[PDB]
Amino acid sequence: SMQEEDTFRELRIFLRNVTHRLAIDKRFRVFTKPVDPDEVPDYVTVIKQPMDLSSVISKIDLHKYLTVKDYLRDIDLICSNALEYNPDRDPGDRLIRHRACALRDTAYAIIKEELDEDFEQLCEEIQESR
Template identity: 50%
Template sequence: MMKLLMAVDKRDKFRFFTSPVTDQMAPNYSKIIKQPMDLSTMKSKVERGLYDTWADLQADIVLMFTNAKTYNAPATMVHKQADALLTGGLKMVRNFKQGKTKLRGFTGAWRQRCRCSSV
């Protein structure tokens, strides 16, 4: 599970999902997003053995990217990257569940979906 999160983290090129979002970073975030999630929280949960199944981890991945898409307008880089990483992340979870842990091939597809060249 940690390997998967590290791969998602590596593809978060603007570091949008690395750590918890604060209201100082995103005004009224805590009023809009009731269940925040980020990669550092998920990594901590893996280290503490709090994910019993791949479905539990997948739920937090979906939550993190859905939160970003809920808070940020569709035209923003955050929303676009969340959409691309969600698609790629779910594909990775499916592959990991099937025992396929090679991560090659995901980077190009994610770049094409995101087409994020700058913030």
Template identity: 40%
Template sequence: MFWSKLWRPSENTAVSFFFLKPVSKKEAPDYLDIIKDPMDLSTIRDKVRRMEYKDREDFRHDVFKITLNAHAYNDGRNPGISLLADQLLELSDYLLDENHESLAEAEAGIES
């Protein structure tokens, strides 16, 4: 499946470390009080495996959600994490752009 090729590089970079798995109560007891719609790379991986993404916008939306959540929770606390989330989104956008033709073919196959 093409989406797994796109997702895998996002998971295996230094910028992804804080976003690999859901935030635990132990790490951030108030996280779910602030973040109502959490997202992480393991959830994206699971959605890729279940073939839930119909197009690149669905995929990008989930990566963007990681970035929004990182800013909402970490700005003023841990700004370095927000910067890493921005870099993760930039990497995702780069990969989406670099794989534009393959994505268009995959999306066409899903639609038919």
């Protein structure tokens, strides 16, 4: 219905807003474009589902997230790809691992403070009925 649209438009705007607060943050700059294949050749062999804040944005715009839960799962993938790819054997590794976790935990904290539970519930029921 019209009212379902209203709801997803509202969702999309909230998701853009969150992604961009993540993206302007200095610590998270390295998550704002795809790991470049030509510049990191074996990434693709280890990491099967690549994800970064730019492709999250396109996905919002192509209406791929009907819930916040689905959006969070993609932010979580950004983090876990990074923990999975990066060895954990020194301070640079340590820096990047800490930023991935920070990204993930910052996304949760923002959603948690700002997302009305009745709004997400309504998003979930609309998806469950499709």
